[PDB]
Design a protein around this ligand. Structure first.
Ligand code: CLA
Ligand code: CLA
Ligand code: CLA
Ligand code: CLA
Ligand code: CLA
Ligand code: CLA
Ligand code: CLA
Ligand SMILES: CCCCCCCCCCCCCCCC(=O)OC[C@H](COP(=O)(O)OC[C@@H](O)CO)OC(=O)CCCCCCCCCCCCCCC
Ligand SMILES: CC1=C(/C=C/C(C)=C/C=C/C(C)=C/C=C/C=C(C)/C=C/C=C(C)/C=C/C2=C(C)CCCC2(C)C)C(C)(C)CCC1
Ligand SMILES: CC1=C(/C=C/C(C)=C/C=C/C(C)=C/C=C/C=C(C)/C=C/C=C(C)/C=C/C2=C(C)CCCC2(C)C)C(C)(C)CCC1
Ligand SMILES: CC1=C(C/C=C(\C)CCC[C@H](C)CCC[C@H](C)CCCC(C)C)C(=O)c2ccccc2C1=O
Ligand code: SF4
Ligand code: SF4
Lengths: 74, 130, 160, 80, 61, 148, 739
């Protein structure tokens, strides 16, 4: 179980790292855009601030309250 | 006491040049001073200028330029930096056209100038396999 | 009952916990003398422990196999005083705080020195705004309707 | 050696040239700004990559850009 | 646009992109970026002003 | 205890996803570096200018998210191993009671079950678990060299 | 129009209180980003950049010293007030060996009243490990009324120091020439402060502490002991305990000082009743110290044709190997506050560590050697303070080199010659550090791998390859033979740690010969190695603070800067501040190892109980000798074994120690976020958070910026130190209070 979960975490981090690499060196905005309008992938860079802000909110929410309940029990 | 009479009155520091500035390249800075002012070496400690011709050798261009920038505080401006290859291959470096790089001089052509802002740079995906 | 739990009023392990805590407190009480402040403090501890256990027993609280009150937060109003009512209370208080902060930011944002009024608070205006947050649910659903709650495209965006 | 590029947003304020520790940048005549001068990078072989040049740039997103590349004993700042 | 006018920055690589600034002076010479705009928010370098081109600023009504 | 540890797992997943998604989307540029795509996926920084640009590349986002992945997998594996140690030993009441607070974890999982491991070799003898104690100390040493 | 002070220099006004950052030229314009807030506190006490005049900096420093002394006096007044009102000091006086000192009671809220422990004497509260009860007993304080009056005096003194600071900044500020009278200052601090303080304390001991403590040790209850003033008005209450006061001061003025041998003794060892040093020995010590310091205060020429000039002394100490010698050092130390701070802080931390050693080595207070929590806490606290102060001295030496160092004024002197060969110093210190670390730690690892491989005869142990600290054992033998041979007027060795008998008070060991074997050899060399590496980091920071081969103009970047850029392969942390940051880390490492060695060695081979027949049983049982030679031994028999009390403290009166244990772990792990990450990621995340705020029209006018690189490092190191030191604090306190 430990081996497979560690391999799983490694693979997930690698998937996201290679997505970032694709953004840096393989992504072409012209291909993902037709007459100003952007396709499903190019639109992920338009509300990127919304995505990051809501990920930050969820992380802060869960961390604050999980740690709060754990420390309350402590 | 010293090899040359124009050397600054420096007692020598274990921060000077090494075997690199005997087989790759060494840098020499020359300047003329009105007073035997006491200045700080870019490598070690305090040295004394000569009331006249002064010549110093360093291992890096940056060390010579730091010394020259210090010299400007002494109202010294005529300092000139040269690059010496393993043999006596002297090349004037810092006052390249006799005018400091901060002052515009005619006869200089723009090198590395792009006729657009940063936003005009090409997309990296279009610069693949060249 | 819910999730296999049982009421704490009929949980034997709950009463065992109460008895053990009281016994420990009384054993501690035995090593002091007369009506001295230490004995008074330990007696107050015993009384508070008994009161807390009695209140938890008579509180519609479900206890597990460890004799500890478990919270039923699936949403049912039967156990509504465990999560739902505190949830509403916190939502009210936190919305109050956020609303008064946002109102103060937007109010001193239209003055000559907006940054000065953030390290040196305008206490009169701050007090004026803070006591006005009791209507934050109504104020929020009166500014969202007028379009004054959300910016549209003056917000800045990165290069891609 | 590192690569240094100058962009026409240059206002010719000379702060990049007087901040270079290795005499890489210089001011050259130009007609695209009020000062009539633009920075140039004719001695990038001495560029060390310290990026003091673009720390002194007042233009919005820079007019001098340093792209780190192949390393050399001059660019690595090796006194040995 | 003129001195005191309010413009929106259209330059993408700008700390004030999509934001509004105040025009300090529009140069009448043949410079590439004549419009000088002053902003209330300092950028990451601490400056609060920048020169923009004529096609990189849009006047606010 | 399962509820709380599942929420901890959710927090770990969300934070690792936040770091990785932020690095992926901000890979092509941001306000601090609107030309980050011109510098590639992995570069050290953009210099001390503009307030400081440490760990600004997309590679640095991977680098930071590796710690959070390790932490999240550690939480998951700690939860699994403690639950199954209590299940196999029979004292499932130990987990159900002590897993709700942090000191319960520290005392009853780590401190409690580390006793056989550290006594893989003592000033009196050694066991077949001696290699595991050596690997324990080796892992601590490599961890702290990473800290270096 | 006095020649030493300026009258009414600064007006007492509240106007500048309402203008934050008024001191700084850059911060006075007001905040534009959140970096301004952090810069406000980082430059508050940097008086060098607030004024261009040394006089103004000196006056600010003088008033800040007064404020600090007022704070210290308030803290002492609080301690005495707690002893008077919220303590069991009276009960502890009647039963020092069975009552645990407590001077802080906890209010009954949120169930926290469990922290009120059973300290004894019909009292509930937190056990005190600062040793105030023993100090007060040594002072002769036998009533809580005296503690109350000392607290009142402390409050009055704190107000007086506050008024003095205000007066000397706003009403009469001294001039630069007054501050630069280092000869007069040294004369006064040596004679008046030190010598007259020792003399006054010797007088107090002789007239108050000597009789009261002698009566206390005789079994007289504190209620029937006469009030301290009665020992002065009546020469018969003190002449019964010490039958030499009957002669008055005539033996003193007639040079017949032998008559005062009743209360001015030279005994050594410890009092068998209390386990502390003989208070007669302490009084004689303070008298001798007073005379020596008063004599030493008449050395420097101040206002007459008499004494020394420090300038003439330094300038005469040249040599063939040192060029101009100490010429210019007087100008350095009279024109730079940072150099004085460097010297004073380094020697002050070293003095604190020496104090920590001599404390447990020779317990100076009654019933303090048998209070193991007090001894452990005092040692650890003083060693921590010493390490911090030493790192601060190194930091301010680097600051002086960056800011106040003048190359022209230091031509060919000691400072110049040190910089001229900094390479040699740093390279040889690097080699020494590698040698010491390789050896000490690799001997530890060799022991660990030999034990793991089942080869017990290949270890670096006593029953194996043995590394006997023969030099230290020789010194131990020399001290135990000193009374009667080299100290012929001594009756007992200075400390029983060097050898002698086991001293026990109430069946608890006070002091005992500390045997040194191969285990002490390894840990002592570990101490030497860690100290050498810390010195390496700090000395590299000081010497390379102005220039280097990387950055020939590092002095132009200041003392505190993050880098010079990603060029030259990367120029992170080249500052001198970034060396005080790494040196802080290594000081934490060294001091942690030192306190671990002390705790384990004392618990295993000094502390314990003595059976009525004379059998010594220790707290752990002598496991230090054989199990402190491997890292697995330290992990298991010390950390894992003695952490049992901390983890099992829940539900007991020590539960606060477990909570602080967990919280310190949390803070230490929190530090690694700042230590491992970088500013760009956090700035770009704040970008999206700011986008959300702007979308909801709640973006603050003060633009939020991620902490600067230097501030990120400072936050990381501060959190790391707090977490580690707090974890060790909770561990030590819970372990040593439980057992
Ligand atoms: C099948 C999966 C797969 C594939 C095909 C690739 C392929 C690639 N990756 Mg990638 N990656 C993967 C999984 C994968 N990765 C995962 C799972 C992660 C997350 C950890 C990453 C994270 C990652 C990053 C962050 C980067 C790449 C990069 C690259 C490219 C260059 C690789 C390189 O230079 O290697 C270099 C190989 C090494 C440096 C060897 C490292 C060996 C490590 C340290 C382990 C060795 C220690 C070993 C355990 C010793 C034991 C100790 C003992 C005491 C017990 C290449 C296209 C790079 C790139 O530029 O892409 C364009 C880049 O920057 N990848
Ligand atoms: C015990 C150590 C520790 C703790 C508590 C945190 C806590 C946090 N990290 Mg983190 N981190 C750590 C170690 C730690 N980190 C290490 C070692 C690394 C490797 C460099 C990182 C790398 C990292 C990255 C790259 C990111 C985080 C993020 C976060 C936040 C996630 C949201 C959250 O839980 O909000 C709740 C917060 C807490 C529970 C802790 C603070 C609450 C205190 C107790 C309040 C006390 C008030 C008095 C949070 C502040 C992410 C973030 O900023 O999300 C918004 C993010 O992007 N961290
Ligand atoms: C008081 C005004 C205020 C308001 C209305 C908001 C509103 C918001 N913040 Mg926010 N924030 C504030 C202050 C405020 N914040 C401050 C002072 C900080 C610095 C610690 C932050 C740091 C912060 C982060 C890091 C994040 C948010 C996020 C968010 C959004 C989701 C809610 C959330 O996660 O709460 C977050 C709330 C906190 C972390 C605690 C705030 C600290 C106190 C309680 C607020 C200050 C009170 C103030 C002093 C009152 C003075 C007013 C008075 C003078 C009249 C939402 C737009 C998240 C987001 O973007 O999601 C979309 C997110 O990731 N905020
Ligand atoms: C400077 C050192 C110092 C420290 C750390 C403390 C700390 C403490 N004192 Mg204290 N005290 C001090 C100096 C100090 N005092 C001095 C100099 C005096 C003499 C005036 C007192 C007189 C004093 C009294 C009379 C009492 C305390 C109490 C307390 C405790 C509760 C404080 C509290 O909740 O106040 C909260 C304060 C505020 C909210 C104001 C803001 C706390 C442990 C109380 C205590 O222990 O109760 C049992 C208590 O009754 N102190
Ligand atoms: C015998 C005379 C004498 C005495 C006792 C002291 C004592 C002290 N001086 Mg001092 N000083 C003296 C002469 C003296 N000085 C002279 C002649 C000069 C001129 C060169 C200075 C210049 C000087 C400076 C520049 C500084 C000191 C500081 C200090 C303090 C060091 C902190 C310490 O050890 O805490 C021990 C603390 C105590 C024992 C508390 C009780 C001490 C009280 C306040 C008695 C102080 C005696 C005072 C000089 C009497 C003047 C009264 C006034 C009405 C005239 C200490 C209180 C430093 C300090 O902390 O500043 C405040 C500091 O920065 N002194
Ligand atoms: C006699 C002691 C003494 C004195 C007078 C000074 C004085 C000075 N130091 Mg200094 N220093 C000292 C000891 C001292 N230091 C020690 C022991 C160290 C080693 C750690 C240092 C390390 C140091 C560095 C690295 C730097 C200074 C700097 C400075 C200057 C500016 C200080 C400032 O504005 O801070 C204002 C005060 C603060 C910012 C307070 C910060 C809060 C601290 C860090 C946390 C304390 C936590 C506390 C223990 C409570 C935690 C409990 C928790 C549960 C809450 C000033 C001349 C700086 C400078 O530029 O010098 C010219 C600088 O860069 N010092
Ligand atoms: C456990 C983690 C760890 C370890 C092992 C070290 C080790 C060391 N640090 Mg440190 N350091 C650490 C954490 C650690 N650090 C952290 C967390 C920080 C952050 C603040 C630092 C910051 C720091 C600074 C700032 C400095 C050091 C320095 C040193 C060196 C001192 C000289 C020495 O003893 O070398 C000897 C090496 C050892 C003792 C390591 C073990 C070697 C074994 C026992 C012997 C040889 C084994 C053999 C060769 C194996 C061969 C087989 C193999 C090929 C398979 C040494 C390499 C100093 C330095 O550069 O050196 C002078 C220095 O200036 N460190
Ligand atoms: C220890 C050696 C020692 O202190 O001898 C003392 C030796 C004698 O130097 P000087 O005679 O020149 O010193 C005279 C005055 O400077 C007094 O300090 O000093 C050195 O040569 C420093 C070399 C250190 C070399 C480290 C080994
Ligand atoms: C409950 C249930 C169910 C359902 C289930 C489901 C529906 C699931 C789903 C799941 C899912 C749905 C999952 C997902 C996941 C995802 C992920 C994991 C992702 C990741 C991503 C990434 C990694 C990305 C990457 C990238 C980038 C970053 C950009 C560029 C491109 C790419 C793509 C590369 C059923 C009915 C069957 C039955 C049982 C019950
Ligand atoms: C505890 C404490 C306190 C208190 C303190 C005190 C109480 C002190 C005292 C002190 C004192 C009370 C001191 C005294 C001193 C004195 C002296 C120091 C004297 C001297 C004298 C002399 C020196 C003389 C000499 C001579 C002459 C000149 C002539 C004749 C001969 C002869 C020789 C005799 C307080 C509250 C603050 C705070 C807290 C802590
Ligand atoms: C998280 C983080 C930030 C962001 C951190 C910020 C913006 C600090 C925010 C502090 C808040 C706003 C105030 C403090 C709030 C605390 C609750 C108060 C402290 C607790 C008291 C008990 C002392 C950096 O700027 C940074 C820079 C360089 C390296 C690493 C990092 C880094 O890890
Ligand atoms: S890096 Fe920037 S500063 Fe250093 S040389 Fe090249 S250009 Fe001049
Ligand atoms: S930012 Fe971090 S890495 Fe980039 S230069 Fe400054 S310090 Fe070196």
């Amino acid at each position: 179980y430990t081996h497979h979960q560690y391999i799983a975490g490694f693979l997930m981090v690698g998937a996201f790292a290679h997505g970032a690499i694709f953004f840096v060196r393989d992504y072409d905005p012209a291909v993902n855009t037709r007459n100003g309008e952007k396709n499903v992938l190019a639109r992920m860079l338009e509300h990127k601030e919304a995505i990051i802000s809501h990920l930050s909110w969820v992380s802060l929410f869960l961390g604050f309250h999980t740690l709060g309940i754990y420390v309350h029990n402590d | 006491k010293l090899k040359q009479s124009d050397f600054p009155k420096f007692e020598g520091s274990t921060g000077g040049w090494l075997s690199a500035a005997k087989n790759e390249e060494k840098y020499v800075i020359i300047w003329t001073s009105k007073d035997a002012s006491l200045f700080e070496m870019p490598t070690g400690g305090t040295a004394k200028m000569n009331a006249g011709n002064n010549v110093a050798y360093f291992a890096r261009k940056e060390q010579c330029l730091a010394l020259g920038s210090q010299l400007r505080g002494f109202k010294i401006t005529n300092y000139k930096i040269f690059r010496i290859y393993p043999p006596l291959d002297i090349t004037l470096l810092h006052p390249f056209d006799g005018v400091f790089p901060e002052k515009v001089n005619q006869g200089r052509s723009p090198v590395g100038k792009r006729d657009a802002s940063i936003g005009g740079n090409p997309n990296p995906a279009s610069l693949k396999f060249q | 009952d819910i999730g296999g739990l049982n009421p704490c009023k009929d949980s034997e392990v709950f009463q065992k916990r109460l008895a053990k805590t009281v016994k420990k407190l009384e054993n501690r009480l035995k090593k002091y003398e007369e009506g001295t402040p230490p004995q008074i403090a330990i007696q107050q501890q015993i009384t508070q422990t008994k009161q807390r256990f009695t209140r938890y027993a008579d509180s519609n609280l479900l206890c597990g196999n460890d004799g500890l009150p478990h919270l039923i937060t699936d949403g049912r109003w039967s156990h509504g005083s465990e999560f739902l009512l505190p949830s509403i209370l916190f939502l009210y208080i936190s919305g109050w705080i956020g609303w008064v902060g946002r109102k103060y930011i937007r109010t001193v944002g239209q003055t000559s020195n907006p940054t000065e009024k953030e390290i040196i608070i305008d206490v009169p205006l701050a007090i004026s705004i803070m006591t006005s947050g009791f209507l934050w649910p109504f104020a929020a659903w009166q500014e969202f309707l007028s379009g004054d709650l959300i910016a549209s495209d003056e917000t800045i965006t990165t290069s891609p | 050696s590192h690569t240094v590029k100058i962009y026409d947003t240059c206002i010719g304020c000379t702060q990049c040239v007087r901040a270079c520790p290795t005499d890489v940048l210089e001011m050259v005549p130009w007609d695209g700004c009020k000062a009539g001068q633009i920075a140039s990078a004719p001695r990038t072989e001495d560029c060390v990559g310290c990026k003091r040049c673009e720390t002194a740039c007042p233009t919005d997103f820079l007019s001098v850009r340093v792209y780190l590349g192949g390393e050399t004993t001059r660019s690595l700042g090796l006194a040995y | 646009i003129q001195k005191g006018s309010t413009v929106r920055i259209l330059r993408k690589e700008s700390y004030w992109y999509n934001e509004s600034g105040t025009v300090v002076v529009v140069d009448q010479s043949k410079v590439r970026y004549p419009v000088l705009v002053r902003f209330t928010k300092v950028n990451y370098a601490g400056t609060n002003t920048n020169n923009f081109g004529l096609n990189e600023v849009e006047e606010v009504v | 205890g399962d509820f709380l540890v599942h929420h901890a797992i959710a927090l770990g997943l969300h934070t690792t996803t936040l770091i990785l998604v932020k690095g992926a989307l901000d890979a092509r540029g941001s306000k601090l570096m609107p030309d980050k795509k011109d510098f590639g996926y992995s570069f050290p920084c953009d210099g001390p200018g503009r307030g400081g640009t440490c760990d600004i590349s997309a590679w640095d986002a991977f680098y930071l998210a590796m710690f959070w992945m390790l932490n999240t997998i550690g939480w998951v594996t700690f939860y699994w191993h403690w639950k199954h140690l209590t299940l196999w030993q029979g004292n499932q009441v130990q987990f159900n009671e002590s897993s709700n607070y942090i000191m319960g974890w520290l005392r009853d999982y780590l401190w409690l079950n580390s006793s056989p491991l550290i006594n893989g070799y003592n000033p009196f003898g050694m066991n077949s678990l001696s290699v595991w104690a050596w690997m324990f100390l080796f892992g601590h040493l490599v961890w702290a060299t990473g800290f270096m | 129009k006095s020649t030493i002070v300026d009258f009414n220099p600064v007006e007492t006004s509240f106007e500048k209180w309402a203008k934050p950052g008024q001191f700084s030229r850059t911060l006075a314009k007001g905040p534009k980003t959140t970096t301004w807030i952090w810069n406000l506190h980082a430059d508050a006490h940097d008086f060098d950049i607030q004024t261009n005049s040394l006089q103004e900096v000196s006056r600010k420093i003088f008033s800040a010293h007064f404020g600090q002394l007022a704070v210290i006096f308030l803290w002492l007044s609080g301690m005495h007030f707690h002893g008077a009102y919220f303590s069991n000091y009276s009960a502890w006086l009647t039963n020092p060996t069975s009552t645990k000192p407590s001077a802080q009671i906890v209010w009954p809220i949120v169930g926290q009243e469990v922290l009120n422990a059973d300290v004894g004497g019909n009292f509930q509260g937190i056990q005190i490990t600062s040793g105030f009860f023993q100090l007060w007993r040594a002072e002769g304080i036998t009533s809580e009324v005296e503690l109350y009056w000392t607290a009142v005096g402390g409050l009055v003194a704190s107000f007086l120091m506050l008024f003095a600071g205000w007066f000397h900044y706003h009403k009469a500020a001294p001039k630069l020439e007054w501050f630069q009278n280092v000869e007069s200052m040294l004369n006064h601090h040596l004679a008046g402060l030190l010598g007259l303080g020792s003399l006054s304390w010797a007088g107090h001991q002789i007239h108050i502490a000597l009789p009261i403590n002698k009566l206390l040790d005789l079994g007289v209850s504190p209620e029937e002991i006469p009030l301290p003033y009665e020992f002065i008005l009546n020469r018969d209450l003190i002449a019964q305990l010490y039958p030499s006061f009957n002669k008055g001061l005539t033996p003193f003025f007639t040079l017949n000082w032998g008559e005062y041998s009743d209360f001015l003794t030279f005994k050594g060892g410890l009092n068998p009743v209390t386990g502390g040093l003989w208070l007669t020995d302490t009084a004689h010590h303070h008298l001798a110290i007073a005379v020596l310091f008063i004599v030493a205060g008449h050395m420097y020429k101040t206002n007459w044709f008499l004494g020394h000039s420090i300038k003439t002394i330094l300038e005469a100490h040249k040599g063939p190997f040192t060029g101009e010698g100490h010429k210019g050092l007087y100008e350095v130390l009279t024109t730079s506050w940072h150099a004085q701070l460097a010297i004073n802080l380094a020697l002050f931390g070293s003095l604190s560590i020496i104090v920590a050693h001599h404390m447990y080595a020779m317990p100076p207070y009654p019933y303090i050697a048998i209070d193991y929590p007090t001894q452990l806490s005092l040692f650890t606290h003083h060693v921590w303070i010493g390490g911090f102060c030493i790192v601060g001295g190194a930091a301010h030496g680097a600051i002086f080199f960056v800011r106040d160092y003048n190359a022209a004024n230091n031509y060919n002197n000691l400072i110049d010659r040190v910089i001229r060969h900094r390479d040699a110093i740093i390279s040889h210190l690097n080699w020494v550090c590698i040698f010491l670390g390789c050896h000490s730690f690799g001997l530890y690892v060799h022991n660990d791998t030999m034990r793991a491989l089942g080869r017990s005869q290949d270890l670096f142990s006593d029953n194996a390859i043995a590394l006997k600290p023969i030099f230290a054992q020789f010194i131990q033998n020399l001290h135990t033979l000193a009374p009667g041979s080299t100290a012929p007027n001594a009756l007992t060795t200075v400390s029983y740690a060097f050898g002698g008998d086991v001293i026990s008070v109430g069946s608890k060991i006070a002091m005992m010969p500390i045997s040194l074997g191969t285990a002490d050899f390894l840990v002592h060399h570990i101490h030497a190695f860690t100290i050498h590496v810390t010195v390496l980091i700090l000395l590299k920071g000081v010497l390379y603070s102005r220039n280097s081969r990387l950055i020939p103009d590092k002095a132009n970047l200041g003392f505190r800067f993050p880098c010079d850029g990603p060029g030259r392969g990367g120029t992170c942390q080249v500052s001198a501040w970034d060396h005080v940051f790494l040196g802080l880390f290594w000081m934490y490492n060294s001091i942690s190892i030192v306190i671990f060695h002390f705790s384990w060695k004392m618990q295993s081979d000094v502390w314990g109980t003595v059976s009525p027949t004379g059998a010594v049983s220790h707290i752990t049982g002598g496991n230090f000798a054989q199990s402190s030679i491997t890292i697995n031994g330290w992990l298991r028999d010390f950390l894992w074994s003695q952490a049992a009390q901390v983890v099992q403290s829940y539900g007991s009166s020590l539960s606060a120690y477990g909570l602080i244990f967990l919280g310190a772990h949390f803070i230490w792990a929190f530090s690694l976020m700042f230590l491992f990450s970088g500013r760009g990621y956090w700035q770009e995340l704040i970008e999206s958070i700011v986008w959300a705020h702007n979308k909801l029209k709640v973006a603050p006018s003060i633009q939020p910026r991620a902490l600067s690189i230097t501030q990120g490092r400072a936050v990381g190191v501060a959190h790391y130190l707090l977490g580690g030191i707090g974890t060790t604090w909770a561990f030590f306190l819970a372990r040593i209070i439980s057992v």
